[PDB]
Amino acid sequence: AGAPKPPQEPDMNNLPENPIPQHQAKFVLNTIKAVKRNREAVPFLHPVDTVKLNVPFYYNYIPRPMDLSTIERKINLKAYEDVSQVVDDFNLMVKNCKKFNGEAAGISKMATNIQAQFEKLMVKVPPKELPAGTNVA
């Protein structure tokens, strides 16, 4: 080819010491789970099938790919320090699709559609603090 597919994120040797609090991790997880139910998200659920789509040089244009499952795995492995990194990863996913395919491609409109859905949900994200009377041992 044809640049090979880069290794999966995250690097389980650089897991952050202070991850996002669980109440924030539960929210962004349910948010990503809600986006994964959207019919428009199907192409973004998993890494690109470079053989089925016949894009041998895809990883030459996109050196850092991203998908909804990777974002989900990084949350489950506590790889994020701030919820803004989850937003940045979702943005990178949309950016890669528009960069490679272009605003004319209908797959870019699917990415735009799920990004709007993601942004509507992230409006109600709880603050990084715990709450009112949540106790600390």
Numbering used by the authors: 191 to 327
Task: Provide passages from the article that reported this PDB entry.
In conclusion, Bdf1 BDs are required for the viability and virulence of C. albicans and can be selectively targeted by small-molecule inhibitors without compromising human BET BD function.
To identify features differentiating the ligand-binding pockets of human and fungal BET BDs, we determined crystal structures for CaBdf1 BD1 and BD2. The ligand-binding loops are structurally well conserved, including nearly all water molecules implicated in ligand recognition, although the overall binding surfaces are less negatively charged in CaBdf1. However, whereas JQ1 fits snugly into the Brd4-binding pocket, the fit with the CaBdf1-binding pockets is poor. Replacement of Brd4 residue Leu94 by a Val or Ile residue further contributes to the poor fit. In addition, the p-chlorophenyl group of JQ1 occupies a groove in Brd4, which is absent (BD1) or shallower (BD2) in CaBdf1 (asterisks in Fig. 4c). A similar lack of complementarity between the ligand and binding pocket explains the insensitivity of CaBdf1 BDs towards PFI-1, IBET-151 and bromosporine. More generally, recognition of the four BETi compounds by human BET BDs involves 16 residues, including the eight signature residues previously used to classify human BD-binding sites. Remarkably, nearly all of these residues have shorter side chains in CaBdf1 than in the human BET proteins, implying that selective CaBdf1 inhibition could conceivably be achieved via small molecules that clash sterically with the human, but not fungal, side chains.
